[PDB]
């Protein structure tokens, strides 16, 4: 059983951002809106008057009620707040308020906020708060799924990545008369360099339930394409820093290249900070990995689930090949960084797998017959957490050391590489 209650379903199709709902509400795109070159559903809004999108709702669907239930969902990527200018500065990003009644999404330092206000200025807020004083954040500068539901008899709820975060009572609000238009735009933000990314805005004419929200979250994640740490499509030929999810305070290094050497995790990462604003683990540490095309016949640059690839490791501005001799005794096969011309018959083919919580990747090493050597993780040998391929992993959650994320340099993180 399924029920459609769509009032606005904003999507890039053909060659245009349009409303796919039967209403086909009219859209105006300002001249300073950016779109991602590969996924044109990703919309970037700057702190500029012309970086905006306005939706004019059909009259039959404007919200003007005491009892009508409604929900919204959208994905958002919010760059790290860098300066004290952001500290006590709530700014609207999605506005459907007219004359101090309606609804809006706003942001503040470490916050996503939903506000409802009735025509007698009775107001309620539901708030998601996330810290910037944290080693590794699930939320800072990463694609987040937002869902907000409204039941006029009881509660408004905000969900993040399909999980309930905050619920507050709204049964005391009366007539909420929202705007005829929805304005996507940074409104009242003092940080001149602030922006957001947004995608897949929806409005629904019901209170969505927990199952509907989960299904919506799973579907829109696009599990067929692997993601980087930030939640963008993972790509071939792109240098990435590595994060192991069970040892997040460690980074990948190599001692020596060639079959006598090995790679290993070491830490701590050390810190990036601006006093009273953020304090996080440094992300741009260790040897970079580059994903290389092997078996995929697709001619775009995206790494798909189950793609069979090679992995290059960058040491001193030179590319080596991640590889192992699977014959070595023990289920754990230690990985080395080989000269590319000299890899010979060593195992190097990696099956890339997306795992669906944040943006998880697995890497299943295979020999040249296509037989499994195993998922790449790590193993303690003496004092040293060496990288290995091990079928022990394949034969077993966030317990295991075989989950990884790939971190490219991104403007919304602000860290400067050490070199």
Author numbering: 872 to 1227, 1231 to 1270, 1275 to 1297
Quote the paper.
Botulinum neurotoxins are the causative agents of botulism, a lethal paralytic disease, but are also one of the most commonly used therapeutics for the treatment of numerous neuromuscular conditions. These toxins recognise motor nerve terminals with high specificity and affinity by using a dual binding mechanism involving gangliosides and protein receptors. The ganglioside-binding site is a pocket built around the strictly conserved SxWY motif on the carboxy-terminal end of BoNT/A14. Three HCA mutants, Y1117V, H1253K, and Y1117V/H1253K were characterised using ganglioside-binding assays and X-ray crystallography.
Mutation of Y1117 to valine produced a 10-fold increase in affinity (KD) for the GD1a polysaccharide in solution and a 2.5-fold improvement of EC50 when measuring binding to immobilised gangliosides which is in good agreement with the 3.5-fold increase in synaptosomal binding. The high-resolution crystal structures of the HCA mutants in complex with the polysaccharides of GD1a for Y1117V and Y1117V/H1253K, as well as GM1a for H1253K were determined. The most noticeable differences reside in loop 1225–1233 that is shifted considerably in the Y1117V/H1253K:GD1a structure and disordered in the Y1117V:GD1a complex. Mutant Y1117V, while causing the loss of the Y1117V-Neu5Ac5 bond, provides additional hydrogen interactions between the hydroxyl group of Y1267 and Neu5Ac5, not seen in the wild-type toxin. Furthermore, the Y1117V mutant also presents more extensive bonds to Neu5Ac5 by interacting with the main chain of G1279 (N), and making water-mediated interactions with V1117 (O) and the side chain of D1118. One of the major differences in the binding of HCA Y1117V compared to the wild-type resides in the novel hydrophobic interaction with the Neu5Ac5 group. Mutation of the bulky aromatic side chain allows the sialic acid to occupy the new hydrophobic space offered by a smaller residue. In addition, it also causes the repositioning of residues 1277–1279 within hydrophobic range of Neu5Ac5. It should be noticed that these residues are closer (0.5–1 Å) to Neu5Ac5 in the Y1117V mutant compared to the Y1117V/H1253K. More surprisingly, mutation Y1117V led to conformational changes in loop 1270–1279 upon ligand binding, with residues 1276–1279 providing additional hydrophobic interaction.
